[PDB]
Amino acid sequence: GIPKTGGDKSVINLKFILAAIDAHKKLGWEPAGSKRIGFDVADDGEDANATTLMHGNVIMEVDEWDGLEDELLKSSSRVYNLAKIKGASVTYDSIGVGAHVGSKFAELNDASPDFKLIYDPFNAGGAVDKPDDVYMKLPHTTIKNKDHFSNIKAQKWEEVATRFRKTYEAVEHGKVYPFDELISINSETIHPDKLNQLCIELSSPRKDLDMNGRFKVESKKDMREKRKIKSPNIADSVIMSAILPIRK
Ligand SMILES: [Mg+2]
Numbered sequence: 078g079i080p081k082t083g084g085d086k087s088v089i090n091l092k093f094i095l096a097a098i099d100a101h102k103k104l105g106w107e108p109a110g111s112k113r114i115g116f117d118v119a120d121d122g123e124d125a126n127a128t129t130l131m132h133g134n135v136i137m138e139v140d141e142w143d144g145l146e147d148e149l150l151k152s153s154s155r156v157y158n159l160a161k162i163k164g165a166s167v168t169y170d171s172i173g174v175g176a177h178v179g180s181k182f183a184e185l186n187d188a189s190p191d192f193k194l195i196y197d198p199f200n201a202g203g204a205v206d207k208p209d210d211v212y213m214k215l216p217h218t219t220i221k222n223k224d225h226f227s228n229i230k231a232q233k234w235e236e237v238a239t240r241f242r243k244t245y246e247a248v249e250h251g252k253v254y255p256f257d258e259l260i261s262i263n264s265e266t267i268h269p270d271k272l273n274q275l276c277i278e279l280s281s282p283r284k285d286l287d288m289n290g291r292f293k294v295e296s297k298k299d300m301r302e303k304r305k306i307k308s309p310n311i312a313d314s315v316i317m318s319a320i321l322p323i324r325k
Pocket of ligand 1: 117118119120170173174175
């Protein structure tokens with residue numbers, strides 16, 4: 078329903094995530110579309126760097142590695158080379174340590190004669206895409222995107238959750254959607270440990286409220302302090318890998 082605070086409701090219901098595992102095999106489509114990498118950048122020892130590779134609407138690869146700011150170059154190079162091998166764009170956490178990532182990418186693009194990496198910064202607290210669009214129509218007013226979402230992070234998290242929910246509807250209830258509106262997790266290219274961790278992490282952050290009454294994702298800080306839960310870096314990389322480019 079409406080955005081609320083407290084409770085224990087996941088932004089992405091675990092049963093949606095389970096239903097999405099090999100959902101493209103169950104429903105009958107193969108990965109087709111743009112290739113995108115989400116790159117979450119570690120900020121403390123409590124964090125790890127995470128990458129998620131999606132092809133179209135299918136999560137294809139997940140990876141995790143340690144590294145702080147003083148090896149950022151190496152990390153950046155890693156993500157660059159992955160992007161060159163997979164032929165993918167990159168959306169990366171651009172706050173904190175990530176504020177120093179763009180430079181690195183630029184350098185590599187400047188040295189590359191053939192490959193130009195398309196990379197976009199993602200500021201979780203930034204403004205929502207299409208703020209004046211209608212999120213929900215009412216008898217005489219409309220809830221706008223700017224009325225429902227606290228920030229762009231909430232917007233992207235709910236967009237991915239909507240993908241998972243439609244996928245659950247299609248798998249468990251036989252409901253019909255255009256396949257591009259769904260999402261799938263490719264088990265054959267993801268280690269079972271990583272698949273389990275992905276399922277746990279994506280369903281870890283809870284629904285919350287900002288002080289304007291807009292939907293907000295439970296903060297990492299609140300997860301760590303109020304609930305003593307590790308940072309779901311892989312889930313953040315997944316959310317960033319699902320982001321579709323805007324302005325053209
Ligand atoms: Mg970060």
